[PDB]
Ligand binder design. Structure first.
Ligand SMILES: O=C1CN(Cc2ccccc2)c2ccccc2N1
Ligand SMILES: O=C1CN(Cc2ccccc2)c2ccccc2N1
Ligand SMILES: O=C1CN(Cc2ccccc2)c2ccccc2N1
Ligand SMILES: O=C1CN(Cc2ccccc2)c2ccccc2N1
Ligand SMILES: O=C1CN(Cc2ccccc2)c2ccccc2N1
Ligand SMILES: O=C1CN(Cc2ccccc2)c2ccccc2N1
Lengths: 216, 216, 216, 216, 216, 216
């Protein structure tokens, strides 16, 4: 990555490389893997971002969908920021293309130059955005269960049902508005008869704390 | 986080990310997880605090109650510190809102600016307070056992009973006044007949050391 | 803790937090846990000392006896160093109370101010002393076996007997004078008949090396 | 390696040495091992590159093919950059040969001199290129399965088939053009009858996301 | 310990504390534990040396013999370097006693003062010498087998016999002169008849390499 | 070791000490242990080199052959660089002897003085050379199998045979000339009849890549 002490390139650490590989091995495309990807790639160059994706041995269908997302974003970058086709000014910073941000057509030195310019051209953060957009599509793709089939079992603790409910909603990537809203509708409709009766009785404007307390 | 050598942003470490994920995996919302959360989030930006919460794959009912606690606190921040609605002074520090402290509407650069201002606007510590208040509600919620059902078994060592007693009291979050007070009342009432007889005999003003020595 | 490079606050490390939690999990209140507590808390602020104690999930009877020891010491600090009750001199160092040393009524900034004053008011070391005094009472409390029941088995190697003997004496916290003295008395009385005969024959002023060599 | 704080030699870390040995033990010449080799050898001298290859205990047929690749590249370096045969200018930088880049005929000091010259003679990066070219030949060699035998099982989830497909294609080292192209041909021909029918129906210009969604 | 960047006190690391505890748990007083003790205590203060010994939970007979060795050495230090009994010169370095070197009567600050004086009074290294002398007595004590009972089995590879032989000799702490000398005498006498015949035939002045090659 | 930030002594790390001990425990005198020894001893003083060898608990026949190799090299150093026998010039650098390089007769301070002189007297690297020469003799000694008994099994994959072949050749320490030469002779003679027929047909000047491809 690029770190302080002034802004300089540092080798990606064995600890970082290993954490990323292990999390994918243990968690595949469970949603929590995305924020972990983001955090492990703090200060990453495009090269570092390619390194972490390349070190993954499985999930090559995901990696191939991911490349499709990156080309779409690359093409929209190029549509928005076309670069003049002439030869570059001797010893001057060339403008980055989509493929330069994705690190397919840029060197580490070019990447350093952009990310440490004043002001920075933050190619690391631009590419991380493309990748995370791509990873989110995959999370949703690999979400195995519709929220509509998350229903509380006759003998299932309400807390365990809410855990499954909100885990499913996270993979299906319903926004926060739909997370706080489902609280007074689908969460209750999908509750078992006993709890549903208690939750109906509470009235509307019940916090999730109040609902969860109410169903024991 | 933000650390010295002057005050600068540092990437959250793989060691830190992994410790937090593991403690939640092993301990869920056992009370000792909260002080561990606090310590692992030493110097954290709002972004870092969101990162540690986001990296958690389970407990999504807790994470959703947590968001409710954060909105209540956000709203009370906004009620107490309203921000002028105008466009910002070029290159000047804007005042943070509830949502800026919770890191939903603030950038890392804004967060750095606040936390490294002279004097600091300590948005990291303000948000950690909201989160810990939220986590404590959850600890109490997930405390499975009333102190009233913690009673010493006929053949249970007094020390093991006191361990269960004070573990339960910690999850139920009785204050220190009620921890030092329960010593001369509920701890004795909940003791087995043999030990209760010994503890009655000691008289009042017996230290817990004295009680525990007295019951072998 | 507080460390050099000048004296500055540093976050307690994940490695430190984890070592302390694990040692308590593996060793409970075996005496060797105390010197390990001391070493893991090198340079600790009162806050850090509370952090390490708070991160412990079990042993809440011990943690509650510990608080009793800390209040006694707090009260003796207050008896010895009363603080004037007036409002503080603007931007000046207030004097610490018992509760400020125990970190219940002091901020991290106050704690830093004291421990980095010239000369230091070493609140970290004052509190570590209180805690270790408290932990030693607990070690002795949780010592399961009187030295008087440590007797060499008919077929037990003398070395294994001496190991049990001096382990017991450590938990029971006999001073060094009583450790070097027990050598020519209780160690011999508690030996098996065969070894006792050999040890009687050696005469007095036999080193433990000489005794252990003598009993094969 | 060579790192900043100015450009200086640093010992290869135990963490780095161990990561490389373990990845080869776990993954042999699975393609993801190459980008991991590249990342673990960030800032490496030729000596460091020889160190990581030498620390490998198995795969000596691979290590011997690797040496053949390195001699071919060494010979092409020498063909392109012949060095004058005279004795060197006292205290001056000699020009590197193939064998000097491969670290068989160069000292660490010479390697440091080249890699830290202004501008650098980047012998570390030149040698890493030779080695990675050699490692890629081996990956392809050790790829056990033709893409032509990757066909979706009657009851095999389309996602699992695509994973095998694109894993195989990676080991066989088909370029990106042939990865994005196989999408509308061999991936579909190799699908099971049910999915093939669905994929035929989609028409051409279907994204892999669209195909994978379409086959459930 | 005391380290450079000028000479300053550093906290003993969790990694160091844990390595020492584990090596004693795994290896007890096998001779290789002593050089490991020495290396783990690089730059140690007397306090650090007491910390590593105190963190050991077993082997309290050894720890008690160790204290006897330390008092003997302390007494010989005092016999050789008596200290004037007067009160100290305000703000001046007092001379260390045996008990000050063993860290029983000295503070960390005093220890720092001595070890960082110009020239250093190297109390860390003086105490490490006493301790290692004490640990060596214990290694020999706990050596279970006389070299005289190390004899090659009828079917035991000569290499395995030599391994047992020289392991035993190390615990029994025969000097290097007696290690290189035993080569042409006891090693051969203790060999099995077949190998003994081969070794007799070699003649004297045979290297251990030559002997080991000769016996297959 | 000795490291930069100017050239200064650093404690050998717990990580380094542990890596070396573990590699010997897992790999004994498999050839790959030597380059790992070299890499773990980067910047080592003679003292550090003795520390790593001393920390090894087994293989005392090897350690004793090793000492014989070190004395031979010590004696050749003394034959080549005799030292004047007079008393040293006050506060001046004495010349090192064989035994000073092997760290038996030199202090750490003397070792630092030599290795940090301008120019350096590189006693660390001189001793590492002696040791590695000694370790290589042992690797060959402990190589269990002649290359002549490495023959491809009727049903053994050619790749697995070549792996055994070149592993054996590495332990037997045939030079690179004999590794690249054995390719067109012994590798083919030792192949099974089927593969031998294919390899004979290829003709001479076949790469190992070509041979391995040819035998499936
Ligand atoms: O090296 C790389 C480059 N890219 C970007 C890319 C984008 C589109 C097409 C090819 C490559 C990548 C994307 C995803 C996984 C791994 C990688 N590995
Ligand atoms: O990213 C985030 C932001 N917040 C604050 C928030 C507060 C209220 C509503 C939405 C978000 C959060 C809170 C809890 C767990 C995870 C997260 N993750
Ligand atoms: O936060 C804390 C504060 N104290 C001191 C205290 C002293 C007396 C009464 C309450 C608190 C403490 C003591 C022991 C274990 C954990 C803690 N945790
Ligand atoms: O030491 C080395 C040197 N080389 C380069 C070399 C190149 C060609 C011939 C001999 C040596 C090497 C290559 C591959 C694996 C290990 C090593 N180990
Ligand atoms: O704290 C200590 C002090 N000493 C030196 C000592 C020397 C003689 C008598 C008492 C103490 C010690 C020696 C050995 C193991 C542990 C320790 N722990
Ligand atoms: O301390 C040491 C010194 N030497 C050199 C030596 C050389 C020859 C004779 C005695 C000692 C050594 C050599 C090999 C293993 C361990 C060690 N340990």
């Amino acid at each position: 990555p690029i770190v302080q002490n002034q802004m300089v390139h540092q080798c990606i650490s064995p600890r970082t490389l290993n954490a990323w590989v292990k999390v994918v091995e243990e968690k595949a495309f469970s949603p929590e893997v995305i924020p972990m990807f983001s955090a492990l790639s703090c200060g990453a160059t495009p090269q570092d971002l390619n390194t972490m994706l390349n070190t993954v041995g499985g999930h090559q269908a995901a990696m191939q969908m991911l490349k499709e997302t990156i080309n779409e974003e690359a093409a929209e970058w190029d549509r928005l920021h076309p670069v003049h086709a002439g030869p570059i000014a001797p010893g001057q910073m060339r403008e980055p293309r989509g493929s330069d941000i994705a690190g397919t057509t840029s060197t580490l030195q070019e990447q350093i130059g952009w990310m440490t310019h004043n002001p920075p051209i933050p190619v690391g953060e631009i590419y991380k955005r493309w990748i995370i957009l791509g990873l989110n599509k995959i999370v949703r793709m690999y979400s195995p269960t519709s929220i509509l089939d998350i229903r509380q079992g006759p003998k299932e603790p309400f807390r365990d049902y809410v855990d499954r409910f909100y885990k499913t909603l996270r993979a299906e990537q319903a926004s926060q508005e739909v997370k706080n809203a489902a609280t007074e509708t689908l969460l209750v409709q999908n509750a078992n008869p006993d709890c549903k009766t208690i939750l109906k009785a509470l009235g509307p404007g019940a916090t999730l704390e109040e609902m969860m307390t109410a169903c024991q």
